[PDB]
RNA sequence: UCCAUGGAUCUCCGAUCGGGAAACCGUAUCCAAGCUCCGUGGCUAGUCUGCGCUCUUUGGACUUUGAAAACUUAGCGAACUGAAACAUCUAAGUAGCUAAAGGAAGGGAAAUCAACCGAGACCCCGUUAGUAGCGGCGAGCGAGAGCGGAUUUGGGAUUUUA
RNA sequence: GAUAGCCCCGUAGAUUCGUUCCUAUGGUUCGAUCCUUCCCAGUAAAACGCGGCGUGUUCGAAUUCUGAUCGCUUUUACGCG
């Protein structure tokens, strides 16, 4: 629901039971994903950029090698966050500039 | 020449356009800075090859497609994608003698553009580029 | 994780070496301090050209 | 291939259907 | 009178320029190129010779906002009741609410079934059967593959290369 | 004005109506391919919690949807086998 503005890596809250240990009671609850607003560093702008990422997404940006070289990935898989689509197209056009 | 090739195929006659574009290849128009951009649009890159594969070698020989290492990656991609490994290694040695992308660096450069896998089966012409070519 | 150093630094290898390091110790620090870079080839390829 | 090559080239069901059609000729 | 076609006018809210106590109250720009209109300069008055405006209209680009019953697919998600009371279970992924979409939507051409034999996307309708399986192994929940019909479709990326 | 085949209107139908046999062609053909777009992965599993599986979830649950963590898999020999 906040992913509409966050870079939540498709990670999505899940609503389900919680089961007691012995009596077996079922009482509803949710599971909210890890969320740590961070200041990543984008080698295009070379200027810190503050967004609300998960840690799944954090580690993914890491492996791909930073926010920049992570942005240059599948738009029809980032297609969850249209503002993410915008991030991608902007950074890709600025690399175009640097080409 | 434009009028003649127009007679060949603006009327869209196929082998006529073929022989006429071979005649323009033989006409060997300039390829200095923008006339080469005209010549590729006269020999394209890759695709059907055949009659074009001649002006491919030819426009490589005009001076070279060394206008850029990047456009040279485009030209090597064309040569590979025309599945013409022979003309491919030919033009390869051609630029090599003709001030290529500095093989003492162009080696690893082709290595990287090969890890990009954009031009794949030209790994054979790359084995040539690493053994003889 | 690992990165490549744009300059030598204490307790770490020489300038032009590739070095394995800790994730936070790279992202929060040494990435913006601009002392090392990720080893995606786009940067690996710029290192040996800065040298 | 040099590694684990393209799976078998054709979708196994779109090989069985074709071998069925083929042998249907005898 | 009247029919059909096609044209004229065509008040307001809903409403979407701003306000709003619904049916009322407030209101275009920029730029070209058009005659008229209104002073301005020309002093050289020479089509007496020329500039710069406006209200307007054309013709553009700026200037900009859309709704439904059921259906579908999702997000949430309950109790009454059943068990002869009740906490696991049922009710029920129902009621209801929200969001998105089209006239259908989905689903879709095998990291699938079956059992050494074979099959061949997807659904939908019979059947396997209330069978097997689940379950304070209670109450109840309750099939897949396969057979019969409806359908009839695969296509593309593969590319065998000059 | 009572129960209508032939009293009336329609109704069957016949008809008129607007119902297929048909466009070349210049403008120049980005001159019918004188073009080519980004792929091994935080991925499959795994542990826990959940749940969808018509089979309370690993006291026995097989596949499975997802949250936090963590995370795999392969070209090279006298120019040739």
Residue A21 Cα distances to A71, B22, B80, angstroms: 44, 84, 66
Q: Is B72 exposed, middle or buried (0-12, 13-18, 19+ CB in 10 A)?
A: buried
Question: Which structural technique was applied?
Answer: cryo-EM
DSSP state of A11: -
* Closest CA relative to residue B91, chosen from B64, B111, B112, B109: B64
Is A34 in contact with A54 (CB distance < 8 Å)? yes
Reported resolution in A? 3.9
Q: Is A22 helix (H, G, I), strand (E, B) or coil?
A: coil
- Which H or E run contains D22? helix D13-23
Distance between B74 CA and the closest CA of chain C, angstroms: 19
Q: First CA to last CA across chain A, in angstroms?
A: 37
Is B72 in contact with B56 (CB distance < 8 Å)? no
- d(CA C8, CA C36) in angstroms, rounded, equals 9
Q: First CA to last CA across chain D, in angstroms?
A: 33
| Torsion over CA: B11, B12, B15, B17 (sign) | positive
- Which H or E run contains B124? helix B123-131
Please enumerate in sequence order all residues whose Cβ is within 8 A of that of C30, keeping only pairs 6 or more positions apart, or say none. Answer: C3, C21, C36
Distance between A65 CA and the closest CA of chain C, angstroms: 6
Q: Is C32 on the interface with A (CB under 8 A)?
A: yes
- d(CA B101, CA B76) in angstroms, rounded, equals 12
Q: Is C51 on the interface with A (CB under 8 A)?
A: no
- Rounded to 5°, the CA angle A33-A77-D3 comes to 105
């Amino acid at each position: 629901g906040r992913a509409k503005r966050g870079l939540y890596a498709g990670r999505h809250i899940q609503y389900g039971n919680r089961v007691s240990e012995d009596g077996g009671n079922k009482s509803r609850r949710c599971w909210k994903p890890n969320v740590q607003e961070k200041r990543l560093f984008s080698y295009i702008f070379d200027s810190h950029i503050k967004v609300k990422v998960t840690t799944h997404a954090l580690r993914c940006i890491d492996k791909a090698g930073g926010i920049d070289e992570y942005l240059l990935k599948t738009p029809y898989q980032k297609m969850d966050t249209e503002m993410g689509l915008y991030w991608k197209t902007k950074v890709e056009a600025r690399y175009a500039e640097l080409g | 020449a434009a009028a003649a090739a127009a007679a060949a195929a603006a009327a869209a006659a196929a082998a006529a356009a073929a022989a006429a574009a071979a005649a323009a290849a033989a006409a060997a128009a300039a390829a200095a800075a923008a006339a080469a951009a005209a010549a590729a649009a006269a020999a394209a890159a890759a695709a059907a090859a055949a009659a074009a594969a001649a002006a491919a070698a030819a426009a490589a020989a005009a001076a070279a497609a060394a206008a850029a290492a990047a456009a040279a990656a485009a030209a090597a991609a064309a040569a590979a994608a025309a599945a013409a490994a022979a003309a491919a290694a030919a033009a390869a040695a051609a630029a090599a003698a003709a001030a290529a992308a500095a093989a003492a660096a162009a080696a690893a450069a082709a290595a990287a553009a090969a890890a990009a896998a954009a031009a794949a089966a030209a790994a054979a012409a790359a084995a040539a580029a690493a053994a003889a070519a | 994780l690992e990165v490549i150093l744009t300059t030598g630094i204490e307790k770490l290898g020489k300038a032009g070496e590739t070095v394995k390091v800790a994730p936070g110790y790279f992202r929060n620090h040494l990435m913006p301090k601009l002392l090392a870079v990720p080893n995606i080839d786009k940067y690996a390829y710029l290192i040996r050209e800065q040298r | 291939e040099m590694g684990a090559w393209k799976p078998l080239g054709i979708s196994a069901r779109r090989r069985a259907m074709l071998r069925k059609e083929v042998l249907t000729n005898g």
